[PDB]
Each structure stands twice: as C-alpha cells, then as structure tokens.
RNA sequence: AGCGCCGGCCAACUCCGUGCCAGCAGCCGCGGUAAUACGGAGGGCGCGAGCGUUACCCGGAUUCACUGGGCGUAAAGGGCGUGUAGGCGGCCUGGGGCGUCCCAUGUGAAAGACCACGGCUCAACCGUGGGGGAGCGUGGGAUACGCUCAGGCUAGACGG
RNA sequence: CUGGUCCACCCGUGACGCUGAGGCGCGAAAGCGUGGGGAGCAAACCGGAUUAGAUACCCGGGUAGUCCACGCCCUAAACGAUGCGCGCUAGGUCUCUGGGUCUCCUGGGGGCCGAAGCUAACGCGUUAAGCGCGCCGCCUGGGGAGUACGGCCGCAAGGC
C-alpha cells in the first residue's frame, strides 16, 4: 500500500534546529538542511502500518491530532473518511487525562443540537437566542471532530509530536500508544509507531495521512478510491 | 590518569545512562579480564579489541531491557550499578570467609585473586580471596 | 506479687472476655456480658482513635493479663524467645504455656489459672511424682502432672475433677481422670491455641 | 476491595488580608496484604474529602511488590530528596522492624518480615515516596536472569 | 501495698479550688475567674516489695560519618603561585614474592559469653560437654592486583 | 629587557607524572619609615544649609593622603562566596584568537540556553554544582569571639 517516490513528495527538512535523538533516522545534511534517509522511513511505515492494520480489524479508535496550519485542514478530510475523531483546531488541555469532564462539554454540544432543532421555545428572550447560538458555533469550532470519541482511543496519531507534545504526554500518561509522523525538530523515543518524514509540507502530510486512512478503510470493511488533496 | 579501572567502569556507567550501544576504553590485559566477567555474567553483550588513531581500545557492547510503558519509556539497565571497591587511595582486600554477597545473590563482586579475576561465587568455589575490585548489579 | 485485684475491669478495658474467673465467666452475670465497656467514669464516652503505641500496649497487656503474670517475668520469657531458635512469636506462646500453673489449668484441675496457682502454691500439684509449688516451673514433654495423693480426697479438686470427664483437651496434652493425672506431650503449634491475640503485635511492642 | 491506613493528616495554611485560611493534606497507603500497594497524598478544604481524595489517588498509583515468604528479595537503599530509606531482608521470626511511615507501607503490602532504617530528612511525606520508589525497584532472581 | 504518671512526645479525664498568684517543667510549654498542664478529689494508665528521682556510661546521634556526612547561597575552598616531605600514578614482558590470598601446625590459660545437658522442688546460682574465633610464630604453596628489581613502548608529561 | 599562553608540523625524550603538611615568593586599598612631589580630589578639621536636633547626607573651604623611589605592613564581599589535575556524559546560539579541503570543519579561551544527571530549592549543566579516581585545605548549633591567654611576626597600626 506503501509507494516509494515519497521522494517526490517530502524527504524531510530543517536546518540545525534539530533534536539529536533523531540522529538514527538521518542520511546527510544538504541545503543547510537535515535530509531524511528514506530507506529508514520505509522500514518504519511498514511497522507502523502493521500496528495501524491490527487496530482497524479489531475496530479500535484512533485519535487524530494536528493543528499547525499545514496539517490543519487535511486532518478534517482524512479522519472524517474513517469517521474517527480528531482535533483540527486548538488542543484543549486534559482531553485524554481529563476525558469525562472534557466530554461533559459535548453533551452541551448535543444539547444545543436538540434545542436548536426547534422548538422547545423561541419565546426564550431574543438575545438568549443569539447568545446560545454563538456558544453553539464555538463548541462546534473546537469539538467538531472530538465528539466521535466516546472513550479513550486505543491509539492516537499525531502530525507534529513536538508541536503536540502535550498530546503525546497525555496519551503516554494513560498508556495510549502514540503514532506520529515527525521530522528532525522532534524526539523519536517519545513515539511508539513513527513516520520520520517532513511534517510541514502539505504534500507530505497528504501522502502519509491518506494511505493511513486508505489502510484503515481497506482492512475495516470496504475499499475506496481517491480522496480530496489541495493541489 | 590515576585509576584505569575506575575510569573504565565510569565510561560504562556514563554511557549506559544515555543508552549508547557501545563505548571505548583504553586497553589492558587486566581491564579485559574484567570485561570477560562482565560479559560472561551477561552485564554486557561483550567486547572486542578495536583501534582508534593507532591506539588500542576495548569497544564495549552495552545491553539494556525492553522499551517501557508510561511517560518515560527508557528501558531498565542491565548494569544498574557498578562502583570501585578497592581504590588506589585505599586498597581493600578480603579473605575467603569475608567475601560479600552482592545484592543478596542477584549481583556480583568481581575480585582479583592469585587464581585470576573471579566472582564472589567463583572465588568461594576455588576457596581463595583477594583485592575486591568492584561490585555490579 | 501478681495482680490480685478486681479482675473484671481487666476484661472490660481489653474489650474482650478473658477467662480470668472460671465459672462466672460463662454465665450472663459476667461483667463483659452486662457492660462490655471500659471501667470507670468515662467508659461509655466515645472512644477516640487509639495510637499505634496504644494498640500494641493493649495486645501485650491482654496476653499478659491472661496469664496473671508479672511484667518482668513476661519480659524475661520474651527475651528468652528472641534468643531461641525459630519464630519468636510461636516460641513465646509456647514458653508462656509450659508454666506449671498454666499446664494445670489447661488439664482442667482448676477453673481459673488464678486458682491453678494457689493449687500449685499450696503443693496440691506434683510433677513426675515429686511435689512442686512453683507457679513458674518450666514443664517439658513427658512430664506426669498429678494431683497430690493427700489432696485427691479434697472437696474442691473432686468437684473440679468431676467436671472434666469427656471435655477434650488440646492436642499437645493427654488427661487421665480418676487417676487424677495428665501428661505434657509437646510444645503447642500456634494453631493448637486460639487466644484473642495477634502475637506479632507483641514483638512489635518490644522493639521500640 | 483494599485495606486502608491514614499515615499523615496535617493542616496547612496560607495568608491573606484578614487572616490565615486552611487546607488539609492526607497521606494514605492502601493495600491487599498480598503484594500490592499504593501511596496517595491528597488535599482539600476539609479533612474527610482530603482522605477520600487521598485514597482515590492511592489506587491510581500502585506497585507490585515481589514478596518471598513475607520478606523482600534483596537489600535496597533509596534516596528521595534528602530522605533515605533502607530495606533489608529478614527471616520469619523477625517481624517488621520499622517506623510508622515505612511500616504502614510494608505491612499493607503484605511484608511481614524486614529490617529497615530511616536516614537523612525524616519528613514523613518524603520518607513515604522514598519507600515506594524503593519497593518499585525490587528485582527477583528471575527478573534478573531475564534481563541478562 | 506501695510508688510514679494521666496537655503532646506517652498508656491513662472529670469536678472543685486558685486566677501570670500559688505553683509545674526533660523539651515544646502551662497559670491573667469554665486550666484534661498548678493544688486536692473521684476516676483512669503503668509497674509492684517495690516505684521514682539525681549522677554517670553506650544508644537513639550517618551529630567525627571505616561501615556511614559534608564545604555556590545553610557551618565549611587556603588571597594566589612556586615547591620540600609525604600520599597517589599510563601500556607490554620477565625475575623476586614484601603487601595480598590459601593449606598445614603451635599459640590463642581458667573463669565469662554462645549452643547441649544436668544438679539445687524452679530460677537466680552452679556443674559436665561442645563450638569457634581474630591476632602473632612456624612450615608449604599462589602470583591476578599493589610492591620491588630488570628490559621494552608512546596515548601522560616534557622538548624541537 | 622579560613571563605566561595558543596553533601547526607529528621531528626529539621515554611515565621524566598529579597533588602538595611545612618552607619561599607574590599579594587591591588604607596604613607606616626615609626622601621627593603636590594640579585635581579629599579622611580629619572650619563654616553654610537641611532638620525637632543634624558631630551626617547636600554647599563653600581644607591637611594627611592620593603621585615617585626605596623599605615595611599582609588585610579584604582577596568572590565564581565554587582548591588543583586527569578521564567520561546531547546539543542550540553569540564571541575572542589560531590552523584548515576557509560553504563548512578542527583547536584554545569568554558568555548565554539547554540533554542526561544533580540539587532543599534557588539553580548547576563539556567553563558541572553530572558520573568517577588522586592529593590538599576546610566545617561539626547561635552568642560570647576572631575576643582572652600563650607563642610567632610587625616601627606602629595591627597580623597569624
Ligand atoms: S466474668 Fe469472666 S470473663 Fe466476664 S469479665 Fe469477669 S473474668 Fe472476664
Ligand atoms: Mg516540523
Ligand atoms: Mg569501603
Ligand atoms: Mg520480685
Ligand atoms: Mg501495626
Ligand atoms: Mg529467633
Ligand atoms: Mg483465652
Ligand atoms: Mg481460652
Ligand atoms: Mg532494642
Ligand atoms: Mg516485580
Ligand atoms: Mg528528603
Ligand atoms: Mg543528598
Ligand atoms: Mg533470604
Ligand atoms: Mg523531625
Ligand atoms: Mg512513670
Ligand atoms: Mg513510656
Ligand atoms: Mg493518650
Ligand atoms: Mg491564692
Ligand atoms: Mg476552674
Ligand atoms: Mg503533666
Ligand atoms: Mg491535674
Ligand atoms: Mg530508635
Ligand atoms: Mg557514632
Ligand atoms: Mg548521649
Ligand atoms: Mg566516610
Ligand atoms: Mg551534614
Ligand atoms: Mg557561608
Ligand atoms: Mg579561591
Ligand atoms: Mg596568608
Ligand atoms: Mg615527590
Ligand atoms: Mg609509589
Ligand atoms: Mg602501574
Ligand atoms: Mg612485576
Ligand atoms: Mg609474600
Ligand atoms: Mg589461628
Ligand atoms: Mg577460654
Ligand atoms: Mg534441671
Ligand atoms: Mg563451662
Ligand atoms: Mg563469637
Ligand atoms: Mg610475577
Ligand atoms: Mg621500567
Ligand atoms: Mg603524548
Ligand atoms: Mg615522534
Ligand atoms: Mg603543584
Ligand atoms: Mg604553604
Ligand atoms: Mg599590599
Ligand atoms: Mg597604597
Ligand atoms: Mg597611603
Ligand atoms: Mg608615605
Ligand atoms: Mg559642620
Ligand atoms: Mg546649624
Ligand atoms: Mg557639615
Ligand atoms: Mg566637602
Ligand atoms: Mg574642594
Ligand atoms: Mg590648595
Ligand atoms: Mg605622616
Ligand atoms: Mg597617622
Ligand atoms: Mg566578583
Ligand atoms: Mg577565576
Ligand atoms: Mg573565605
Ligand atoms: Mg589546594
Ligand atoms: Mg572537593
Ligand atoms: Mg574558530
Ligand atoms: Mg582561518
Ligand atoms: Mg583568562
Ligand atoms: Mg567554547
Ligand atoms: Mg570579560
Ligand atoms: Mg545555564
Ligand atoms: Mg531534566
Ligand atoms: Mg556547549
Ligand atoms: Mg550542592
Ligand atoms: Mg559555639
Ligand atoms: Mg588577633
Ligand atoms: Mg581582623
Ligand atoms: Mg597576645
Ligand atoms: Mg585568614
């Protein structure tokens, strides 16, 4: 499922803004830039996917996290397809570590979904209409992919582990295994199942996350063909 | 340099703590014999006589445990603990009846005897004592 | 010597019946039966949490109060046990048990150890023949513990000998009524006794 | 369920205009007397809530102590800050020879026979955690061959 | 049958009297009119022909730290060099065997202590047997490490 | 005239090394002796203000001294409050000074930020306060006291 001209898409980046634990996954340093050994990226995509596979055919949830502008939209796409939860926007603190309390805020999300599905009163004072709606958009704005999550995931997939160290931390505290794509600005040992590739190119984020979803649906019940990529 | 032995053990302790696969220590027909015990007892994968810039070393292949669950995945050590006993500042010598039982059996005491470098267990077996080089677990 | 005073307050303070009298111990006229709360002005006040020290004092005192024994004599035995091979807690109980006056009461010749002393002390008991009036004689395996010949014909021992005819006596002991003579077979395994005592807590008292 | 002991319950305070305002702190150990112990320290505006919270955290933090005839396998020394705890194997009669803090932990853990010593700061809290991390580093003859 | 204690450490709580007084006190501390902390009392806890105080020794005190501590700010780096004695010292090979290690053997009195048993009705006390030891002398051995002597080396050091 | 130090070459020596009780030298300022010198500054000191007062701070004056030679003194927040040497344990950035195949790399030094680890915390972190060996110095509750006595040094002040 794997493809080999990811060279055509990503082969990493970043200058000496590195982390030296990532040494093992590195070929050489060219444009004043850390260049990732693709043959290692390979050994790993495999091992990661083997983990990814076993998780779909047992029907286990995956939490998708990425909020840097690059991976922002493409997680709303690729995760919706597998219908699995995500946070695209802001990563609220304690989403895993304080799940039951965070979630007590989705019942509020649902409660507005009902209360706005009419009527249950519109003789509620005018501003109160306007007020509650604003709240609705707000919840929707962060929680739109989170609600799908009704229990702690059996695993989580992250786009930037550094950028989302909080996430990685919360998972790790819970024993929730962490899969992530990650370039040289990151700490390897911190990831269980790892994709050493560029994490800032919309090209790259695209290849890696898509084939993930494609591998999810394929061993889940079905197969599908192409899904949206911004040119 | 004042204690070649202490130096070796420390080269090891220091490397094991940031999880190096190996580390080089200046070579000696005495340091080797100690490594011969460290490997045989499974504290190290083993050692091989290499060369750096024309000069003899012992490359020492380090061994750890499984990756772990929780926020600190750093594996457990195989050599949790290694320390000089005898020193140049104070030579420490035991007779056979007074060889220590490291860590309640689960650890070893390497010692130098006139029947070669032995462990506590081995020394008791041939029934000799000597300079107590160090302790490992 | 030994305690020699009101003996029901002992039980009440200990929060447990200790069978320190004999007969009245089994009746509903027993003190613990009527007032199962500590002697004196504040017995009914709500107890506040005993301290650890407090706890181990009581368990020690309880064990001691059972045997009517002085604190020294108690200590000297315990220390003996600490020097002696094995589990100290067991050996301690064992040695507490091998006391003549205790042996006698265990073989039923008396209703209370407190009565089993005055018997030994008044020489009505003997061992292997020879008379013994020492409440502290350390009885060994093999010993014949009998009522004195000149005491066989006595109202009280008769009444008390009559009461043992088929009540079974601990696995470490054999008893021959009519013959008025019992026998010390071995030292009690702990199971062989079921005293209301966590004896471990006693060790813990003496290690402070 | 688990057996439960309160080791320390202390009052602290903070200053404000108009006066000191208090808070309570609850050190609790929890165990099955058969090899499973947990330590929890919990704070709240009142005594019982604190004890409850404490007990809660305790269960959320455990360790599997490898007993052996009611004694630990080997000698262990651990420093947590300035506090030090010493744990040392003892044979059957010995009992638990220890101060309250590491006593409560070892008893509710099902340790029945051990020689111990507190060195350095004998602050209860720190001695508590120091005894925990100590237990948590215990290794079995197996554990060791398997490692090596 | 007595003696100490009953604020916390520390096991044992109420009434009266007193009112920063009289007094207690090992440390922290009690007493200024509702004192479990003074004095008496009832009651309770602890030991018992004893209980308590004073003195002194070790302990707790890893608080002189060999076992087993420390020195930026807590007590603690010499104002800085140079250097005497001393302490300590890289890689390789041999000789010696001083340290070191092992075996043998002598010594290591008796009593005491430790384990067994036994005699005084128990015990205390006392007897018989057993187990050893460090440490020193002697004899024989080992030679890894430290030493010493001897011969090599160049990674320390010094020089061009 | 003269010391230290770094680099490159890898040419020479063949462990010639580290530390160092004592000893010896050097040691800011103030101060001291003998002799110079003396513009500015300025203890003491005079006077004006300020102020309740103002033996101060602020203002106007002003002698030692501050400067030179030679000889003394030998202190200090003489501080990084961090003894010296060696070995080992991620990196990022700024900088001084070398040598390179001069993008960049490699030494020696000075800062910052940080991995592991340390640490009571604060913080330290290849310039360790990390992990280790060698040697030295020092601490062991506050005060009394860096005082007394003694000794040694000093012209004295005073120092140890
Ligand atoms: S009656 Fe027997 S048991 Fe009840 S109190 Fe008196 S002695 Fe104790
Ligand atoms: Mg990136
Ligand atoms: Mg030692
Ligand atoms: Mg007496
Ligand atoms: Mg207890
Ligand atoms: Mg015993
Ligand atoms: Mg009973
Ligand atoms: Mg009974
Ligand atoms: Mg004792
Ligand atoms: Mg285990
Ligand atoms: Mg501490
Ligand atoms: Mg410490
Ligand atoms: Mg054992
Ligand atoms: Mg304290
Ligand atoms: Mg008393
Ligand atoms: Mg007491
Ligand atoms: Mg009390
Ligand atoms: Mg009066
Ligand atoms: Mg009153
Ligand atoms: Mg009192
Ligand atoms: Mg009173
Ligand atoms: Mg003690
Ligand atoms: Mg001492
Ligand atoms: Mg003392
Ligand atoms: Mg020491
Ligand atoms: Mg100290
Ligand atoms: Mg200071
Ligand atoms: Mg200095
Ligand atoms: Mg000086
Ligand atoms: Mg010398
Ligand atoms: Mg020498
Ligand atoms: Mg040498
Ligand atoms: Mg030689
Ligand atoms: Mg010799
Ligand atoms: Mg001998
Ligand atoms: Mg003798
Ligand atoms: Mg006898
Ligand atoms: Mg004898
Ligand atoms: Mg002995
Ligand atoms: Mg030789
Ligand atoms: Mg030579
Ligand atoms: Mg060289
Ligand atoms: Mg050359
Ligand atoms: Mg020097
Ligand atoms: Mg000097
Ligand atoms: Mg000067
Ligand atoms: Mg001057
Ligand atoms: Mg001057
Ligand atoms: Mg002058
Ligand atoms: Mg004036
Ligand atoms: Mg005036
Ligand atoms: Mg003036
Ligand atoms: Mg002026
Ligand atoms: Mg002027
Ligand atoms: Mg003038
Ligand atoms: Mg003058
Ligand atoms: Mg003058
Ligand atoms: Mg400075
Ligand atoms: Mg400096
Ligand atoms: Mg100083
Ligand atoms: Mg020095
Ligand atoms: Mg030092
Ligand atoms: Mg440069
Ligand atoms: Mg250049
Ligand atoms: Mg400089
Ligand atoms: Mg530098
Ligand atoms: Mg500068
Ligand atoms: Mg820093
Ligand atoms: Mg850290
Ligand atoms: Mg650096
Ligand atoms: Mg420190
Ligand atoms: Mg003083
Ligand atoms: Mg002076
Ligand atoms: Mg002075
Ligand atoms: Mg003088
Ligand atoms: Mg001085």
Centroid of chain to Cα B86: 13
Position in ligand 1 atom list of the atom nearest CA C17: 3
Q: Do the Cβ atoms of B73 and A173 come within 8 Å?
A: no
Q: Are strands C125-127 and B130-136 parallel, antiparallel or unpaired?
A: unpaired
Which of C13, C17, C23, C66 has the most ligand 1 atoms within 8 A of CB, as the residue to mutate?
C17
Alpha helix positions (H), chain B: 4-16, 31-40, 120-126
Give residues with Cβ within 8 angstroms of A80, minimum separation 6.
A86, A145
Q: Which two tokens stand for residue A112?
A: 């507005």
Out of C52, C88, C204, closest to residue D93 by CB? C88
| Angstroms from B41 CA to nearest CA on chain A | 29
Q: How far is the CA of B7 from the C1' of F109 (A)?
A: 28
Q: Which strands, in side-by-side order, build the sheet including D19-31?
A: D3-16, D19-31, D36-44, D62-64
D23 forms beta bridges with D12
Task: Enter the tokens of residue A17.
Answer: 């803004």
List the single residue in D with minimal CA-CA distance to C200. Answer: D95
Q: Which one of D64, D69, D73, D74 makes the best mutation probe of the B interface by having the most chain B beta carbons within 10 Å?
A: D74
Q: Which chains touch B (3 or more CB pairs under 8 A)?
A: A, D
Name the structure determination technique. Answer: X-ray
DSSP β-ladder status, D36-44 and D62-64: antiparallel
Which residue's CA shows the smallest distance to C1' of F134? B2
CA C29, C34, C37, C42 torsion: positive or negative?
negative
Interatomic distance C29 CA / E50 C1' (Å) = 36
Instruction: Give Cβ neighbours of residue D11 (< 8 Å, ≥ 6 apart).
Output: D22, D23, D24, D25
Provide the greatest CA pair distance for chain D.
63
Deposited resolution, Å: 2.8
Q: Which residues contact A229 (CB under 8 A, 6 or more apart)?
A: A74, A206, A210
Q: Which residues contact A21 (CB under 8 A, 6 or more apart)?
A: A187, A188, A189
D147 to B78: CB separation less than 8 angstroms, yes or no: yes
- Contact assessment for residue B125 and residue B116, using Cβ atoms and an 8 Å cutoff: no
Query: Strand F nucleotides below 7 A of a protein CB?
Result: 17, 85-93, 103-104, 115-117, 119-121, 130-135
> B50-59 — which CB contacts under 8 Å span 24+ positions?
B50/B24, B52/B24, B55/B26, B56/B26, B56/B27, B57/B24, B57/B25, B57/B26, B57/B27, B58/B24, B58/B25, B58/B26, B58/B27, B58/B31, B58/B32, B59/B22, B59/B23, B59/B24
For chain B, strand residue ranges (E) read: 22-26, 44-52, 55-62, 82-84, 93-94, 108-113, 116-119, 130-136
Euclidean distance between CA atoms B63 and B136, whole angstroms:
14
State yes or no: C11 annotated in a binding site. yes
**A74, A205 Cβ separation under 8 angstroms:** yes
Q: Consult the annotation and say whether C110 binds a ligand.
A: no
CA dist., res. A77 & res. A89, Å (int): 13
B7 touches strand F (CB under 7 A): yes
Helices (H), chain C: 8-14, 31-34, 52-67, 71-83, 88-97, 100-106, 113-121, 149-152, 155-162, 200-205
Is residue C28 classed exposed, middle or buried when 0-12, 13-18 and 19+ CB atoms within 10 A define those classes? Answer: exposed
B64 C-beta less than 7 Å away from strand E: no
CB-count exposure of residue A39 (10 Å: 0-12, 13-18, 19+): exposed
d(CA A6, CA A10): 6
DSSP state at residue A154: S
Domains (range + CATH), chain C: 1-96+194-208 (1.10.1050.10), 97-193 (3.10.290.10)
Chains with ≥3 CB–CB distances under 8 Å to A? B
Nearest to A95 by CA among A169, A163, A182: A169
Identify how many contiguous H helices and E strands chain C contains and give both numbers: 10, 4
Distances (CA, A) of D16 to A122, D13, D20, D22: 47, 10, 6, 11
Q: Which helix (H) or strand (E) holds A34?
A: strand A34-35
Instruction: Tell me how far the alpha carbon of residue C1 is from its chain's centroid.
Output: 16
Residue C52's SS3 state is helix
Contact (CB, 8 A) for C119 and C106: no
CB contact under 8 A, B73 and A169: no
CA angle A126, A132, A134 (to 5 degrees): 105
Supply D91's token pair.
Answer: 């044979």
DSSP D6-24: EEEEEEEEEEETTEEEEEE
What does the alpha-carbon distance between residue D131 and residue D104 come to, in Å, rounded to a whole number?
10
Whether D93 sits inside 8 A of C207 (CB atoms) is: no
Cβ-based contacts of A189 with chain B (< 8 Å)? 73-74
Query: How big, in percent rounded to 5, are the helix, strand and coil portions of chain C?
Result: 40, 10, 50
Q: Return the biggest CA–CA distance within chain A.
A: 68
Question: How far is CA B65 from each of CA A120, D10, D77, rounded to the nearest angstrom?
Answer: 61, 41, 22
Considering just the CA atoms, what is the radius of gyration of chain B in Å? 15
Nearest-nucleotide field for B3 (CA, C1'): F133
CA C40-C45-C46 angle, to 5 degrees, is 135
Q: Which helix (H) or strand (E) holds D37?
A: strand D36-44
Question: Residues near ligand 1 with C-beta < 6 Å?
Answer: C 7-8, 11, 17-21, 24-25, 30-32
Structure tokens, D127:
């001695």
């Amino acid at each position: 499922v794997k493809e080999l001209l990811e060279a055509g898409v990503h082969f990493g980046h970043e200058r000496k803004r590195w982390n030296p634990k990532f040494a093992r996954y590195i070929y050489a340093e060219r444009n004043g830039i850390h260049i990732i050994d693709l043959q290692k990226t390979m050994e790993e995509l495999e091992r990661t996917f083997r983990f990814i596979e076993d998780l779909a055919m047992r029907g286990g949830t995956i939490l998708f996290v990425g909020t840097k502008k690059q991976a922002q939209d493409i997680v709303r796409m690729e995760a919706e397809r597998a219908g699995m939860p995500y946070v695209n926007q802001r990563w609220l603190g304690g989403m895993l570590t304080n799940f039951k309390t965070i979630s007590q805020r989705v019942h509020r999300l649902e409660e507005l979904e009902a209360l706005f599905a009419s009527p249950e009163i519109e003789e509620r004072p005018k501003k109160e209409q306007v007020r509650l709606k604003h709240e609705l958009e707000r919840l929707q704005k962060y929680l739109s992919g989170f609600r799908l999550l009704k229990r702690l995931p059996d695993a989580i997939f992250v786009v930037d582990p550094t950028k989302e160290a909080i996430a990685v931390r919360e998972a790790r505290k819970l024993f929730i295994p962490v899969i992530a794509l990650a370039d040289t600005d990151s700490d390897p040992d911190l990831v269980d199942y790892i994709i050493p590739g560029n994490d800032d190119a919309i090209r790259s984020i695209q290849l890696i996350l898509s084939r993930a979803v494609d591998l999810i649906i394929q061993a889940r019940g079905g197969v599908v063909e192409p899904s949206p990529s911004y040119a | 340099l004042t204690d070649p032995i202490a130096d070796m053990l420390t080269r090891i302790r220091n490397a094991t703590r940031v999880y190096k696969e190996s580390t080089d220590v200046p070579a000696s027909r005495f340091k080797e014999e100690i490594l011969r015990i460290l490997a045989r007892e499974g504290f190290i994968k083993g050692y091989e006589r290499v060369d750096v810039d024309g000069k003899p070393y012992l490359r020492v292949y380090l061994k750890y445990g499984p990756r772990r669950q929780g926020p600190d995945p750093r594996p457990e050590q195989v050599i949790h603990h290694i320390r000089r006993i005898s020193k140049p500042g104070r030579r420490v010598y035991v007779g056979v009846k007074e060889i220590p039982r490291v860590r309640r059996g689960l650890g070893i005491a390497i010692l130098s005897t006139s029947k070669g470098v032995l462990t506590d267990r081995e020394a008791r077996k041939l029934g000799v004592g000597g300079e107590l080089i160090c302790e490992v677990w | 010597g030994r305690y020699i005073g009101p003996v029901c307050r002992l039980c009440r303070r200990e929060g447990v019946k200790l069978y320190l009298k004999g007969e009245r111990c089994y009746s509903p006229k027993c003190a613990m039966e009527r007032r199962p709360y500590p002697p004196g002005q504040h017995g009914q006040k709500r107890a506040r949490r005993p301290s650890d020290y407090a706890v181990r004092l009581r368990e020690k005192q309880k064990l001691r109060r059972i045997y009517g024994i002085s604190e020294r004599q108690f200590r000297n035995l315990f220390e003996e046990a600490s020097k002696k091979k094995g589990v100290t807690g067991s050996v301690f109980l064992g040695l507490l048990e091998s006391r003549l006056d205790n042996v006698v009461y265990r073989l039923g010749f008396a209703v209370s150890r407190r009565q089993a002393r005055q018997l030994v002390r008044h020489g009505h008991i003997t061992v292997n023949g020879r008379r013994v009036d020492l409440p502290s004689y350390r009885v060994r395996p093999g010993d014949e513990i009998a009522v004195a010949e000149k005491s066989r014909n006595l109202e009280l021992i008769r009444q008390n000998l009559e009461a043992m005819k088929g009540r079974k006596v601990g696995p470490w002991l054999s008893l021959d009524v009519e013959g008025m003579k019992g026998k010390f077979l071995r030292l009690p395994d702990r199971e062989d006794l079921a005293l209301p005592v966590n004896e471990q807590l006693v060790i813990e008292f003496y290690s402070r | 369920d688990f057996e439960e002991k309160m080791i320390l319950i202390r009052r602290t305070a903070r200053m404000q205009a108009g006066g000191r305002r208090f808070r309570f702190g609850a050190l609790v150990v929890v165990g099955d007397r058969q090899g499973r112990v947990g330590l929890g320290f919990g704070k709240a505006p009142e005594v019982p809530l604190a004890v409850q919270k404490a007990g809660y955290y305790a269960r959320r933090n455990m360790v599997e102590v490898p007993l052996q005839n009611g004694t630990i396998p080997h000698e262990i020394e651990v420093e947590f800050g300035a506090s030090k705890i010493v744990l040392k194997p003892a044979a059957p009669g010995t009992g638990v020879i220890a101060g309250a803090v590491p006593r409560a932990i070892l008893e509710l853990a099902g340790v029945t026979d051990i020689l111990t010593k507190e060195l350095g700061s004998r602050n209860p809290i720190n001695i508590a955690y120091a005894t925990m991390e100590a237990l948590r580093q215990l290794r079995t003859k197996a554990d060791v061959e398997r490692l090596r």
